[PDB]
Design an enzyme around this catalytic site. Structure first.
Site, PDB file in Angstrom:
ATOM      1  N   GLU A 209       0.828  -1.205   0.000  1.00  0.00           N
ATOM      2  CA  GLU A 209       0.000   0.000   0.000  1.00  0.00           C
ATOM      3  C   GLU A 209       0.865   1.260   0.000  1.00  0.00           C
ATOM      4  O   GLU A 209       0.857   2.061   0.935  1.00  0.00           O
ATOM      5  CB  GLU A 209      -0.963  -0.010   1.190  1.00  0.00           C
TER       6      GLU A 209
ATOM      7  N   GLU B 228      -4.049  -9.482   0.593  1.00  0.00           N
ATOM      8  CA  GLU B 228      -5.059  -9.076   1.565  1.00  0.00           C
ATOM      9  C   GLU B 228      -6.429  -9.243   0.932  1.00  0.00           C
ATOM     10  O   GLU B 228      -6.731  -8.596  -0.074  1.00  0.00           O
ATOM     11  CB  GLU B 228      -4.846  -7.628   2.012  1.00  0.00           C
TER      12      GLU B 228
END
Length: 1209
Positions: free
Chosen positions: A412, A497
């Site tokens: 991220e 994820e």
């Protein structure tokens, strides 16, 4: 300041006898240098997190993303001396971890700084230390300026600290590297090639000839292979590498279901004899990530059932603890997990050790963000200078580990789309490849998600980065799983994820609705697996996406264990502090999604019934059964509701799995609730029983029974035992919705590490003695001390029978032989004139946690102690060992009269509940059905009170109650208008004279054609701050509806919001069931606000379109009820009907001295004008009777305590 102990061990523990201080009023000048006086500073041991000790400041610089625990600057100091045994040999100081911006000083000089803090580091210290024998003062400054992380991280030294003492010629910091190239081929001949790329450094003043002896030790301890190199010169001050090769015949391969390992001992030889030794444990393994067939360890294919995790250990805070991490890994393994994705930062050494022992794959995350920082004080502030060092150190530390199969570069990262991002990614991959070259490098990306329904086109720079890394990870981008495989065959894909859903334990709201990131009033999330963040997915959806695709190696469900901070569905909420993503709550009690994943992944048969069975009669309740069995049927208290089954569907390549025709992986029923027992049986493909599970309704709370996971723990001073406090029915069934306050008490060779309940919305400090149970469970953690013995834990709840459990503490030397470690004592509680029951066999606990049951001989019994009321102890013996048994038996029941009170007033019968308490004068708290005496209206239609007899059912004695003069409630009927009534009056902050506020209840509206009705707030002076309207009531009824219609004109608009409130009689409070609507200027509306005692009802407003003023058209309100009244202070106090000595308001406590053994006194008290007095008759010899009274309207009260005292025996 005692000298450090040392007995030849290469690494010496350094966690003992330190001092700590937290800055609270500015910098503490002169802390670094030895001149500081830290006498007042507290002592403590180093596995420690000074951010969990504090309390939740809602103004903490860390918002919800961080848990609201304060950060700041902390100081550590230790004074120590080096024993002469270690003089003249190299010593170094090693930290396994210390959070952001460490700055350490030694002897008043800067010894170094290290910002990253999620990773171990070291400093060379031998020169600095005083060889004269003086006191060396070590100081560590931690500057965890709070706005520095997304998830709660703790602060201070949260990992173990060591000293490393070695000869001047010694192995390097990580000077061992065991690898087995071409194992995939050599395994065919049962031969494991091994290479030992060991390194040695020489700190001596002149080069010395050096020799290596390395021997591979079997797991048991026997040798396997040995090697010895020819001697070569070791240039002073420089590292000289060595390489050795050997073959292991018939290797024992490391595997998930069989984690075997080999121990390597490298002995450095100078002058013909050993000078230094090094230990490193490795394993023989080989794995491949194939772009078509996915992951496969050895020659076996297997999906990567994995979960992400956070370093947060729960109630312990960030402080590392071997047993806690082991428990987390063991629970996750019980879930069927294969791999663990470590946070977004490196792993603790205990995590890696647990992975190796239990056999779980590990993925290490390097950074949460590159140079582009995500918070003002995040790690990106230091990235440009320290990224290479941090990544190099992480890879070097983890390289020997067999569990690790990856080196993730980041996750991220918002600058990954730029060219500079590609440059940084290439540099990072190069740096990682410098040390290790046998594990792929990866990265987790989320920008590729886009619209999660379509195959989002891939940004060019993202494509370059994905080409750079060996394996590509995706965040919540299930839509791109197959498309990118087609468009890029060379890539290898897996889910970094997936399924960021939310769920709380024991909450079962809106069963038939799926909502995307919706808050609720109670600050909870449904456990039906129907709540998730907008970008997430239902667990079933993500598992279906992963299961169908061969090339996808697997997923990593986010947040196996929930963690402090990041309550995403409740951004900026005040009481919310902990993430809801957890498949297992912070304490460690599994949720239901645990059992879902267990059914999906684990091959063993099992069944679990989702909802609890304490619903209302006549209600339909959704019931889901997670199972891998082919059939299930529910026997509802005798009758089969109906059978449901799966279909053995096969994937494209033939993988078998079970699922319904509708496409759901879980069975479901709609059942009208009937109190009783509900059992489910799992039937195999032939219809034969293979597994069972049941849910049974619970009754009133009865006891607080405690259960410990491991009843025997080591005496090393850090091993833990996790004790679960359960609120249970008299039958022993945990009450599903129990929530009471539990007060613990621990004594012996142990201390209370912490407490937990798992309530994400609770703000109750973890490091405290008492804790409120949530969903009928709570957790207390106790850690052993240095001394062997036993730890006894005692828990108590007001109104419920207490309980106690023991934990035995054995020395580390004891924990390899099954010597008797202790015996648990039987606790019994029976009614008077009831015989006891002693089990013929009792559990005898050897060391090694290998407990068992053994024969018991119980001493003689005298029936006198049971034809009476009291407490005593009974003894016994066991054939196996000379240790004696023990049993505690409680006898209680009918003793004396019990006080109680109720209320009434004019026109209403007293509140006569159908149940009475069996609160005899012995501590009894049983409940029984009661019918109270009939009273005529002559007593009721006037002021005053009266005594009402309680005809209790099944008990010899009746209950006596007294009456207060305040109760008021009649009915809930509908009302239209009053011929005569003064209640309907209203007032507001401002009202225009030309618009009567009282016109808002005429019941007329202008939809078709009627006179104009409105209220106006217009004023030439702006009033955009807000205004409120109020209405008064004096009724005995319940509201049915509420009007909040609006009128608008050229100057007025709809209110922005309505903050409705109720006035019970002493203040203002917000009402429940608000559901304020968005602007409604077109058509009608209706609201059904909650029924509350609302003597005055008020709502505050603000302008929807600021610069304009407020208005209304109709805001009728209907009903109200009243409860409380007035009374006076205390007037009377007595002991056995006598007076009391020195009785006054000032003194805190009073006591009466009695002869020893006297019967417990009867203690009574009264209050002026018949006030509410909490009388408490004496119950047992130890304890004091504490009384409280209600007086006046506010804080007026005084604690009255009478303590029983006696003389010597």
């Amino acid at each position: 300041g005692n000298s450090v102990s040392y007995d030849g061990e290469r690494r010496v523990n350094f966690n003992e006898n330190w001092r700590f201080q937290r800055e609270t009023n500015g910098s503490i000048a002169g802390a670094q240098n030895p001149g500081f006086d830290d006498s007042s500073w507290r002592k403590l041991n180093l596995p420690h997190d000074w951010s969990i000790e504090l309390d939740f400041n809602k103004n903490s610089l860390a918002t919800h993303e961080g848990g609201y625990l304060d950060g700041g600057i902390g100081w550590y100091r230790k004074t120590f001396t080096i024993p002469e045994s270690m003089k003249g040999k190299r010593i170094s100081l090693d930290f396994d971890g210390v959070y952001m911006n460490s700055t350490t000083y030694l002897n008043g000089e800067v010894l170094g700084t290290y910002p990253f803090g999620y990773n171990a580091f070291s400093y060379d210290i031998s020169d600095k230390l005083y060889k004269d024998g003086r006191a060396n003062v070590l100081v560590v400054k931690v500057n965890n300026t709070q706005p520095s992380s997304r998830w709660y991280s703790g602060s201070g030294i949260y990992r173990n600290v060591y000293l490393t003492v070695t000869d001047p010629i010694h192995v390097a910091r990580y000077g061992t590297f065991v690898t087995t190239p071409n194992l995939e081929k050599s395994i065919k001949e049962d031969r494991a090639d091994v290479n030992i790329k060991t390194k040695i450094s020489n700190d001596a003043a002149e080069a010395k000839q050096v020799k290596i002896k390395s021997t591979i030790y079997d797991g048991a301890g026997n040798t396997v292979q040995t090697v010895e190199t020819e001697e070569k010169t070791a240039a002073a001050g420089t590292v000289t590498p060595f390489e050795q090769n050997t073959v292991i015949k018939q290797p024992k391969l490391w595997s998930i279901d069989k984690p075997y390992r080999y121990n390597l001992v490298t002995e450095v030889i100078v002058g013909g004899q050993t000078v230094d030794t090094y230990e490193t444990k490795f394993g023989v393994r080989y794995f491949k990530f194939d772009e078509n067939e996915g992951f496969s360890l050895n020659g076996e294919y297997m999906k990567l059932h994995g979960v992400s995790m956070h370093h947060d250990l729960g109630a312990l805070g960030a402080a590392t603890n071997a047993r806690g991490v082991e428990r987390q890994m063991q629970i996750m393994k019980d879930m069927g997990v294969n791999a663990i994705r470590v946070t977004h930062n490196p792993a603790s050494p205990e995590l890696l050790e647990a992975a190796n022992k239990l056999g779980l794959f590990i993925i290490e995350e390097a950074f949460d963000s590159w140079a582009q920082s995500k918070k003002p004080y995040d790690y990106g502030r230091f990235f440009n200078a320290w990224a290479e060092h941090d990544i190099k150190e992480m890879v070097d530390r983890g390289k020997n580990e067999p569990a690790i199969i990856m080196w993730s570069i980041g996750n991220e990262i918002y600058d990954t789309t730029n060219a500079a991002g590609v440059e940084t990614a290439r540099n990072l991959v190069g740096w990682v490849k410098e040390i290790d070259t046998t594990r792929p490098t990866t990265i987790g990306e989320d920008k590729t998600r886009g619209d999660k329904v379509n195959v989002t086109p891939i940004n060019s720079y993202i494509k370059e980065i994905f080409n750079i890394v060996d394996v590509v990870g995706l965040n919540y981008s299930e839509n791109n799983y197959d498309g990118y495989h087609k468009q890029n065959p060379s890539w290898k894909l897996y889910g970094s994820e997936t399924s960021s859903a939310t769920r709380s334990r024991g909450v079962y709201t809106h069963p038939y609705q799926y909502n995307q990131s919706t808050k609720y009033a109670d600050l909870q999330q449904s456990s039906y697996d129907n709540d998730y963040v907008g970008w997430g997915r239902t667990a079933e959806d993500a598992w279906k996406y992963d299961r169908d695709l061969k090339h996808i190696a697997g997923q990593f469900i986010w947040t196996g264990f929930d963690y402090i901070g990041e309550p995403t569905p409740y951004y900026n909420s005040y009481p919310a502090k902990s993430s809801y993503f957890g498949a297992v709550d912070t304490a460690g009690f599994p949720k239901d999604i645990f059992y879902y994943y267990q059914s999906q992944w684990k091959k063993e048969p099992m069944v679990h019934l989702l909802p609890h069975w304490n619903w209302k009669e006549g209600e339909k309740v959704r019931v889901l059964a997670y199972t891998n069995a082919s059939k299930v049927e529910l026997v509802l208290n005798g009758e089969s509701l109906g059978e449901k089954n799966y279909d053995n569907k096969q994937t494209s390549w033939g993988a078998p799995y079970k699922e319904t025709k509708d496409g759901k992986t879980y069975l479901e029923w709609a059942v009208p609730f009937k109190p009783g027992k509900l059992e489910a049986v799992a039937k195999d493909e032939n219809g034969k029983v293979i597994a069972r599970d049941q849910v049974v309704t619970a009754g009133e709370p009865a006891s607080v029974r405690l259960t410990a996971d491991r009843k025997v723990v080591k005496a090393d001073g850090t091993d833990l035992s996790f004790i679960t406090a359960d609120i249970v029915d008299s039958k022993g069934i945990v009450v599903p919705d129990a929530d009471h306050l539990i007060t613990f008490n621990v004594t012996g060779q142990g201390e209370l590490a912490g407490v937990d309940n798992g309530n994400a919305s609770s703000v109750e400090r973890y490091k405290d003695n008492k804790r409120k149970a949530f969903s009928g469970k709570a957790l207390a953690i106790v850690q052993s001390s240095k001394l062997s013995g036993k730890i006894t834990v005692h828990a108590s709840v007001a109104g419920l029978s207490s309980d106690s459990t023991s934990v035995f503490t054995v020395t580390p030397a004891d924990h390899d032989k099954k010597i008797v470690a202790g015996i648990d004592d039987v606790n019994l509680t029976v009614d008077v004139n009831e015989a006891p029951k002693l089990p013929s066999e009792i559990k005898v606990y050897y060391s090694d946690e290998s407990a068992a049951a053994k024969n018991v001989t119980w001493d003689e019994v005298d029936p006198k102690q049971y034809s009476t009321v009291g407490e005593f102890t009974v003894e016994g013996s066991v054939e196996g060992t000379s240790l004696k048994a023990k049993a505690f038996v409680i006898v209680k029941g009918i003793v004396a009269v019990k006080p109680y009170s109720t209320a009434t007033k004019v026109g209403v019968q007293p509140v006569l509940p159908e149940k009475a308490t069996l609160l005899y004068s012995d501590g009894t708290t049983k409940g029984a059905t009661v019918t109270w005496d009939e009273i005529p209206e002559d007593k009721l239609a006037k002021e005053g009170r009266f005594t009402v007899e309680g005809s209790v059912e099944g008990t010899d004695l009746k209950a006596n109650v007294y009456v207060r003069v305040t109760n008021e409630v009649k009915s809930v009927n509908i009302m239209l208008q009053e011929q005569g009534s003064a209640y309907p009056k209203l007032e507001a902050t401002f009202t225009n004279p030309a618009d009567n506020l009282q016109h808002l209840n005429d019941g007329i509206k202008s939809y078709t054609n009627n006179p104009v009705n409105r209220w106006t707030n217009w004023t030439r002076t702006p009033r955009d701050a807000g205004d409120s309207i109020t209405v008064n009531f004096g009724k005995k009824h319940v509201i049915n509806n509420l009007d909040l219609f609006v009128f608008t004109d050229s100057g007025t608009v709809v209110p922005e919001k309505a903050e409705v409130q109720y006035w019970d009689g002493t203040a203002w409070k917000d009402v429940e069931n608000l559901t304020q609507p968005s602007p409604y200027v077109v058509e009608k509306n209706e609201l059904t606000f909650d029924a509350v005692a609302t003597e005055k009802l008020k709502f505050h407003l603000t302008p929807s379109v600021k610069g304009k003023f407020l208005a209304l058209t109709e805001a009728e309100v209907y009903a109200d009820q009243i409860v409380m009244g007035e009374t006076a202070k205390l007037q009377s106090i007595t002991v056995n009907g006598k007076a009391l000595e020195g009785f006054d308001h000032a003194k805190k406590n009073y006591e009466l001295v009695l002869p020893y053994g006297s019967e417990l006194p009867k203690i009574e008290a009264a209050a002026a004008d018949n006030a509410t007095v909490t009388i408490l008759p004496a119950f047992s010899y130890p304890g004091t009777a504490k009384l409280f009274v209600t007086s006046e309207d506010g804080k007026v009260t005084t604690e009255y305590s009478i303590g029983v005292s006696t003389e010597e025996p």
